[PDB]
Swiss-Prot record:
Protein family membership: Belongs to the bacterial solute-binding protein 1 family.
Subunit-structure text: The complex is composed of two ATP-binding proteins (MalK), two transmembrane proteins (MalG and MalF) and a solute-binding protein (MalE).
GO molecular function, one term: maltose binding
Gene responsible for this protein: malE
Role of this protein: Part of the ABC transporter complex MalEFGK involved in maltose/maltodextrin import. Binds maltose and higher maltodextrins such as maltotriose.
PANTHER family: MALTOSE-BINDING PERIPLASMIC PROTEIN, MALTOSE_MALTODEXTRIN-BINDING PERIPLASMIC PROTEIN
SUPFAM superfamilies, per the entry: Periplasmic binding protein-like II
Location of the protein in the cell: Periplasm
Induction, as annotated: Induced by maltose and the transcriptional regulator MalT. Permanently repressed by cold shock in a PNPase-dependent fashion.
A single Gene Ontology CC term: ATP-binding cassette (ABC) transporter complex, substrate-binding subunit-containing
Name of this protein: Maltose/maltodextrin-binding periplasmic protein
InterPro entries membership: Maltose/Cyclodextrin-bd, SBP, SBP_1_CS
Amino acid sequence: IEEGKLVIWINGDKGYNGLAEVGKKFEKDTGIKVTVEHPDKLEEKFPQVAATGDGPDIIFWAHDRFGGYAQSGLLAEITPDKAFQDKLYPFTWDAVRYNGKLIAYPIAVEALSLIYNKDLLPNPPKTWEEIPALDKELKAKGKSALMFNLQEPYFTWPLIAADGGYAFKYENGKYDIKDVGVDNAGAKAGLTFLVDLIKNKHMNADTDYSIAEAAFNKGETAMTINGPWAWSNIDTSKVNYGVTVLPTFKGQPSKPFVGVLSAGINAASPNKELAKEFLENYLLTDEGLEAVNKDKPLGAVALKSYEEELAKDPRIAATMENAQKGEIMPNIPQMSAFWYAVRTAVINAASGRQTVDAALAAAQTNAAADDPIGLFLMRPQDGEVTVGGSIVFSARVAGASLLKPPVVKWFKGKWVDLSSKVGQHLQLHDSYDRASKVYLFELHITDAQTTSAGGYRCEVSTKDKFDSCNFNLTVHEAIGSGD
Ligand SMILES: OC[C@H]1O[C@H](O[C@H]2[C@H](O)[C@@H](O)[C@@H](O[C@H]3[C@H](O)[C@@H](O)[C@@H](O)O[C@@H]3CO)O[C@@H]2CO)[C@H](O)[C@@H](O)[C@@H]1O
């Protein structure tokens, strides 16, 4: 009763209200309603929901996540005409290329900068090493020098990488997925410096994104480390801030990762054409990007015409100076393993639960680890459902032999093979996508009952290999059934 609908997911720190404004212009022109959501952990949830119908038509994230999604067949291939391709910077298209395919529309280039309060700190430090002394000075005055998010490795990486840390080695035109730079002398020096800041009480291991933002925006701390999306909240506050180059460490620049905010289209969306129309004709226009940017700044936008108009913004200039000193994020599937490993290391080293050496050595091994067997690309995860509701569990498997596909069997408990229970309340659905060479296997549980709850198993086999995983279903009583 709208003409149609598009569902968009974007992270909660981005300009979702501006994006909804572009959506309202789309609706008015087109009759198609646009809903912009920003669920928690959307980037982890997307693979599970992509092909169920609870998936978004469009997903926004930095480009690093998208190679993994593409390996799993989750993203529609983008094949633009030259006319449109030429409107965006080739650099931004490069970020969304995976094994010869464009897998998203690039939106904007982001990097972290040093953001400082000019009334507490007219001249911000040039080196990380000066920060302890600055903080002693500010503490005597009831403030602190620096607060930033210590829970996400994105924010600590620039210091870790400064003297020699790296994610994956790049050479002869490709990333070496096995060659990781997490436990070298450089990374250890950077993480040790961070840990010592915390030991010396210049920072607190528990500081997260909200805490640091509140502290900076209320004038409690002289500096923070953040990206373009944060500037508009600071504008609302009383703070006179600058945006500048990150401090050096051991004489070397901090090396922030460069992220390209990108918009991928769900391969399972029935609305791919509408999604492209929205993205090309509404969002990636001067007027569209202005709406989003005015909500939460995007950085250096991919659209040449508008990037040129904003380039005079000194905040954007500083963003790009930091970006030039840093490294572009890889988009390889292994980046997930890298990020999870480094997150663990920083949190454990910062809190004192592990030594820096132990944290980084473990993270080095974990970031490079492979799936031993190499069948599952995506495993079904624990689920919850209300009594009478429906739930879909999914597995994705990498195809290999053309002649002998992988075969999946689903079980409840030790031995009940669910193909023997297909009926009114259970379905099994298989498909293959030759574009991605990915097999999708689904188990559908409908009219869920208390008895449906418990442990299940998904077994995948080929002529010579086998793997299996377990997952749990929790069945909740409906609200209003009691009392
Ligand atoms: O820490 C665990 C975490 O690792 C992974 O997230 C990384 C992102 O994929 C990556 O893009 C980057 O995220 C930052 C955005 O680019 C930026 O625009 C912004 O919103 O801040 C984000 C950092 O909070 O960095 C992280 C790691 O910090 C992964 O894909 C997640 O599932 C995950 O929970």
